Amino acid sequence: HTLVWGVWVNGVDQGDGRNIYIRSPPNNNPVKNLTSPDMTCNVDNRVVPKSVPVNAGDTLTFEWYHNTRDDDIIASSHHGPIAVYIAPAASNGQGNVWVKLFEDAYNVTNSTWAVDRLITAHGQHSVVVPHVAPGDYLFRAEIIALHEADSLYSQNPIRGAQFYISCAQITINSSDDSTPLPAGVPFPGAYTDSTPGIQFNIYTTPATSYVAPPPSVWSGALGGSIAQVGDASLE
Ligand SMILES: OC[C@H]1O[C@@H](O[C@H]2[C@H](O)[C@@H](O)[C@H](O[C@H]3[C@H](O)[C@@H](O)[C@H](O[C@H]4[C@H](O)[C@@H](O)[C@H](O)O[C@@H]4CO)O[C@@H]3CO)O[C@@H]2CO)[C@H](O)[C@@H](O)[C@@H]1O
Ligand SMILES: [Cl-]
Ligand SMILES: [Cl-]
Ligand SMILES: [Cl-]
Ligand SMILES: [Cl-]
Ligand SMILES: [Cl-]
Ligand SMILES: [Cl-]
Ligand SMILES: [Cl-]
Ligand SMILES: [Cl-]
Ligand SMILES: [Cl-]
Ligand SMILES: [Cl-]
Ligand SMILES: [Cl-]
Ligand SMILES: [Cl-]
Ligand SMILES: [Cl-]
Ligand SMILES: [Cl-]
Ligand SMILES: [Cl-]
Ligand SMILES: [Cl-]
Ligand SMILES: [Cl-]
Ligand SMILES: [Cl-]
Ligand SMILES: [Cl-]
Ligand SMILES: [Cu+2]
Numbered sequence: 001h002t003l004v005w006g007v008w009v010n011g012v013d014q015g016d017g018r019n020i021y022i023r024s025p026p027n028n029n030p031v032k033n034l035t036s037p038d039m040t041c042n043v044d045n046r047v048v049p050k051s052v053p054v055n056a057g058d059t060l061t062f063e064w065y066h067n068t069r070d071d072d073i074i075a076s077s078h079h080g081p082i083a084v085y086i087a088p089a090a091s092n093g094q095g096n097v098w099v100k101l102f103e104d105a106y107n108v109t110n111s112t113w114a115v116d117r118l119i120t121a122h123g124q125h126s127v128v129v130p131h132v133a134p135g136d137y138l139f140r141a142e143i144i145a146l147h148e149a150d151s152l153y154s155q156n157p158i159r160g161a162q163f164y165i166s167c168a169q170i171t172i173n174s175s176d177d178s179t180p181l182p183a184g185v186p187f188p189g190a191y192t193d194s195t196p197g198i199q200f201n202i203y204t205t206p207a208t209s210y211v212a213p214p215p216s217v218w219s220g221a222l223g224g225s226i227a228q229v230g231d232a233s234l235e
Contacts, residue, residue, distance in 0.1 A: 001028040001066060002074040002143060004166035005123070007052055008061035011229045014052050021050040023138075023167040028066065030145065030162035032153040034198070039188035040093035041140060041167035048169060051089070056131045056175035057222070061229045062141045062168065064123035070232040073123040074115060078145035078162070079202055081105035081212045082114040082226065084127050087184065089136035089169065098140060099184035100217050101127045102224040105197075106207035113207065115143060117226045124229055128222035129170075131178040139168045140187070144213075150201035152193050161198050179220030190215065 003024065006017035018024040025042040033039075054060055062084075066072050082104050087097035102125075104114035118125060127139070145162035153160025190213070191198055197213040 001030070002064045002164050003028045004141060004168065005063045005065045005069050007063065007168055008124070008230050009052065009054055010058055013230055013232070013235065017050075017052070017168065020048055021052050021169045023048055023169070028164070030164055032157070032160040032162060034153070034191045034193065035188050037188065039163065039165065039191070041138065042165045045093065045167065051136055051169035051171040053171050053173055054129045055173055056129050058129045059126050059229065060129050060139065060170065061124050061126040062166070063232070064118065064143070070122050073119045074143065074145075074164075076116070076119060077147045078115050078143070079113040080115050080144040080146040081197070082118060082125055083142045083212070084224065085140040085142070085184070086130070086132070086181065087138050087140070088181065089138050093138055093140070093167065093187065096183045096186050098187055098190065099181055100215050101130065101221045103212050103217050104226055105212040106210045108208055114226060115145065118143070121226050121228045122232065125224065125226040126229060127224040129172060130181070130220050130222055131175050132172060132181040132220070133177050134172050134175050137170045137172060139170050141166045141168070144197070146200050146202050149199060150203070152199050154193055161200075181220070182218070185215050
């Protein structure tokens with residue numbers, strides 16, 4: 001159970017984005033139905049009044065929270081991966097449009113899930129804004145909690161992989177467009193009952209065997225991190 005509070009740009013807090021530049025749902029409950037229209041941008045996908053200005057190469061940091069800013073972020077039971085996707089805003093997230101910029105799942109080197117490191121990072125994870133065409137974009141940040149994922153939701157609706165999905169409205173101003181954004185995958189549709197990484201038993205299957213759901217990270221992606229970029233409590 002987690003939500004995005006807002007974003008940072010080059011380590012500068014853009015301030016509370018909820019219902020402003022984030023297409024905030026009404027609560028922190030997960031999406032679980034893989035075929036739901038709610039897979040695109042969660043249950044209340046509409047244009048919000050603001051879009052955060054960025055340039056290609058900027059560090060764009062998403063900041064999550066559970067109940068209040070810079071709290072426990074997400075229950076520690078909610079082990080799983082984190083991804084970030086981009087689509088042109090004109091699509092409203094419809095069609096074959098989502099391109100993956102970032103994936104982190106289970107890190108063998110430090111024996112931790114992305115969500116574990118998200119909590120340590122005070123809810124902050126970043127991407128480098130890619131060299132796509134200037135314009136308006138949706139950045140879809142997705143946490144998959146796998147603590148009940150041994151079942152398919154389609155078999156047992158009380159269980160299933162949990163998707164915490166947040167779409168931020170970002171405007172890319174300066175960009176050399178050296179990596180034009182290609183077509184991507186649809187949400188809903190990219191994840192199905194048979195997709196690797198959706199049905200996974202964290203209790204009995206080693207995390208060193210976990211493969212996050214495709215698609216793979218785009219060749220044009222510039223990278224990211226899970227790391228605290230700013231101190232919320234210095235406000
Ligand atoms: O054993 C089951 C499973 O539970 C996981 O814990 C989940 C709970 O199942 C879930 O019910 C709980 O939901 C909370 C949510 O986290 C809170 O953010 C929300 O708070 C409300 C509050 O109740 C209202 O009074 C107020 O106005 O709004 C806030 C929202 O800011 O309350 C909901 C409803 O209870 O979330 C838990 C995860 O955080 C365990 O983690 C897991 O290990 C277990 O397997
Ligand atoms: Cl839960
Ligand atoms: Cl700057
Ligand atoms: Cl809801
Ligand atoms: Cl709900
Ligand atoms: Cl916890
Ligand atoms: Cl197409
Ligand atoms: Cl390990
Ligand atoms: Cl950190
Ligand atoms: Cl242009
Ligand atoms: Cl099942
Ligand atoms: Cl482009
Ligand atoms: Cl382009
Ligand atoms: Cl293409
Ligand atoms: Cl696979
Ligand atoms: Cl990948
Ligand atoms: Cl690619
Ligand atoms: Cl790609
Ligand atoms: Cl490329
Ligand atoms: Cl910091
Ligand atoms: Cu939860």
